[PDB]
């Protein structure tokens, strides 16, 4: 559970926002791309795994699960690529509510930024720093540090 | 010191690699841009501070220290923008050796990747996972978790 992440893809402004969620903490990382492709998803996972100790990624859909490029990046970075079937049905709700919240935040910041990619990183920042108590950025470090020890 | 980062800009292939180093751990994040501008540096710091608790950034040169756009991002993300004068002379040496190591790794992976940006993230990943026995990725989480506790 310190090493499990879920991918999530949402749309705004004609663009795609790819999100990785660290399941145990709710910490996220995200980027904007014109369209979800295996190549863009593979690069995003390579970024994520150089930053945090990614053991398993639950992919966001069956095309990214199938994609040879995504499988190659998961091989390269040492990630176990898994499906993202909500065998726990609470998962669909949690992801959907996170995407709503993120879009609400983006709307709240959107006029401070020339580009959507700025507004999405402002939203990542607000999400990860929000105290709910500890923030998700505190929870993810506590969780991994406890694993390392 | 859990919150202190240093910016560093190095060149390869006609492109610019911007690196942020977490000084106490040697953990890095990096990206490839066509040229170093205040706008690109500001976006990179907004990304970094949504991912880690960035208290202070030592900027890499006086243009990024002066840049109103960089100052606006550091204000937005709650970062103290400082100069990066090597008041400790060991700094110039450590950064130069880091840039050399990174370029060495990039050359070792470069034929595994179509784009330089891929090879640079491969290098970030290898740097941060290298045991030298803890890795930089373990050391940054240990440091920040110790500060949070």
């Amino acid at each position: 559970s310190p090493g499990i992440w879920q991918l999530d893809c949402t749309h705004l402004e004609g663009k795609v926002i790819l999100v990785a969620v660290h399941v145990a903490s709710g910490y996220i990382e995200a980027e904007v791309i014109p369209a979800e492709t295996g190549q863009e998803t593979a690069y995003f996972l390579l970024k994520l795994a150089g930053r945090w100790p990614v053991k398993t990624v639950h992919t966001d859909n069956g095309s990214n699960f199938t994609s040879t490029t995504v499988k190659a990046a998961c091989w390269w970075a040492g990630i176990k690529q898994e499906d993202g079937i909500p065998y726990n049905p609470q998962s669909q709700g949690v992801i959907e509510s996170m995407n709503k919240e993120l879009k609400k935040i983006i709307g709240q910041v959107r006029d401070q930024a020339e580009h959507l990619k700025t507004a999405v990183q402002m939203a990542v920042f607000i999400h990860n720093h929000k105290r709910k108590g500890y923030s998700a950025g505190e929870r993810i470090v506590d969780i991994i540090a406890t694993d390392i020890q | 010191s859990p919150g202190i980062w240093q910016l560093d800009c190095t060149h390869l292939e006609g492109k610019v690699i911007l690196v942020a180093v977490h000084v106490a751990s040697g953990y890095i994040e990096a990206e490839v841009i066509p040229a170093e501008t205040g706008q690109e540096t500001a976006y990179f710091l907004l990304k970094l501070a949504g991912r880690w608790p960035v208290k202070t950034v030592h900027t890499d040169n006086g243009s990024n220290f002066t840049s109103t756009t960089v100052k606006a991002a550091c204000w937005w993300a709650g970062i103290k923008q400082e100069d990066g004068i090597p008041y400790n002379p060991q700094s110039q040496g450590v950064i130069e050796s880091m840039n050399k190591e990174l370029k060495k790794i990039i050359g070792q992976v470069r034929d595994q990747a179509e784009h330089l940006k891929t090879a640079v993230q491969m290098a970030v990943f290898i740097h941060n996972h290298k045991r030298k026995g803890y890795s930089a990725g373990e050391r940054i989480v240990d440091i920040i978790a110790t500060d949070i506790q």
């Binding site: 295996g38 190549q39 593979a42 490029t69 190659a72 | 595994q112 990747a113 891929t118």
Partner: peptide
Amino acid sequence: SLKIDNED
């Protein structure tokens, strides 16, 4: 293209 970032 047989690269990690583009297996075509």
